[PDB]
Amino acid sequence: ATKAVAVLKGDGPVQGIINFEQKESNGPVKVWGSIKGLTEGLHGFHVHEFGDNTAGCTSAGPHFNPLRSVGSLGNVTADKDGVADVSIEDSVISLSGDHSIIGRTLVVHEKADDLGKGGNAGSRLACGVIGIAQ
Amino acid sequence: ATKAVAVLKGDGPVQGIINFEQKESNGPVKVWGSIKGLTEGLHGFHVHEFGDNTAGCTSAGPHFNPLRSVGSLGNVTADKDGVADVSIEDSVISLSGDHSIIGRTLVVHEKADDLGKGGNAGSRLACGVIGIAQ
Ligand SMILES: [Cu+2]
Ligand SMILES: [Cu+2]
Numbered sequence: 001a002t003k004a005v006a007v008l009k010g011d012g013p014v015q016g017i018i019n020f021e022q023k024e025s026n027g028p029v030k031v032w033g034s035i036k037g038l039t040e041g042l043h044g045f046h047v048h049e050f051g052d053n054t055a056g057c058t059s060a061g062p063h064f065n066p067l068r069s070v071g072s073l074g075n076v077t078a079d080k081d082g083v084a085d086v087s088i089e090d091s092v093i094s095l096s097g098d099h100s101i102i103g104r105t106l107v108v109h110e111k112a113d114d115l116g117k118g119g120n121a122g123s124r125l126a127c128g129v130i131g132i133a134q
Numbered sequence: 135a136t137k138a139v140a141v142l143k144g145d146g147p148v149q150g151i152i153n154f155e156q157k158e159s160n161g162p163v164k165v166w167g168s169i170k171g172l173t174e175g176l177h178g179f180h181v182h183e184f185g186d187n188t189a190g191c192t193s194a195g196p197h198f199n200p201l202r203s204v205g206s207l208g209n210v211t212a213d214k215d216g217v218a219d220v221s222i223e224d225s226v227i228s229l230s231g232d233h234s235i236i237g238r239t240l241v242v243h244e245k246a247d248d249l250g251k252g253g254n255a256g257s258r259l260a261c262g263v264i265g266i267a268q
Contacts, residue, residue, distance in 0.1 A: 131185015
């Protein structure tokens with residue numbers, strides 16, 4: 001596909017809408033949107049393997065790792081008002097092929113992803129299946 | 135993918151969980167599950183174009199159809215207690231390729247689909263994005 005969207009919903013104040021767009025088949029995917037209701041600071045932002053909402057965020061499974069994982073988008077950053085303004089360009093994920101995240105689940109975490117440099121990401125606050133958008 | 139699921143939800147009492155499984159990459163897709171809260175009788179059952187939940191079932195767009203539409207899955211049948219136990223096999227939709235319904239929306243309608251043989255489907259009661267399942 002060319003465009004997609006994930007509506008992030010959970011049991012709490014955290015919610016948001018994240019859009020995805022990829023023009024070239026093997027080109028980067030632009031990810032942008034906003035999430036609010038967050039504790040100030042960094043929050044793990046990943047694509048988890050299953051777009052299964054039968055138990056909400058709980059049935060999403062582990063990170064998408066077709067074989068950091070392909071689903072690891074890093075962190076989003078919430079300001080003191082609890083809002084994270086998202087704008088990313090990623091060339092590992094795709095909206096088509098073996099790396100397609102279409103039909104999988106976008107998750108924002110309670111904690112930061114230390115990305116392997118914690119010098120020594122918690123629960124899934126809000127999640128959404130990634131669907132093909134207009 | 136080889137398996138998928140959609141959780142149907144809407145404004146009213148109609149709820150359901152529908153599973154999909156496709157053994158061979160180009161083979162038929164088996165659809166099964168249950169839906170409750172429906173009026174006895176036939177109810178249009180289709181895959182709509184977009185897996186966009188930003189505006190309920192309204193943002194799902196039209197019937198999925200790459201060239202009955204590809205997206206039409208016929209009707210489901212609610213029994214006298216409003217339960218539609220679903221069991222369908224379809225060789226036109228797929229879980230990969232140009233006819234993939236992954237990332238799109240499954241919708242159960244208020245009225246029957248006449249399938250072009252009405253002798254001369256209404257509102258969207260519930261819907262859910264179709265996601266990859268384990
Ligand atoms: Cu995660
Ligand atoms: Cu329809």
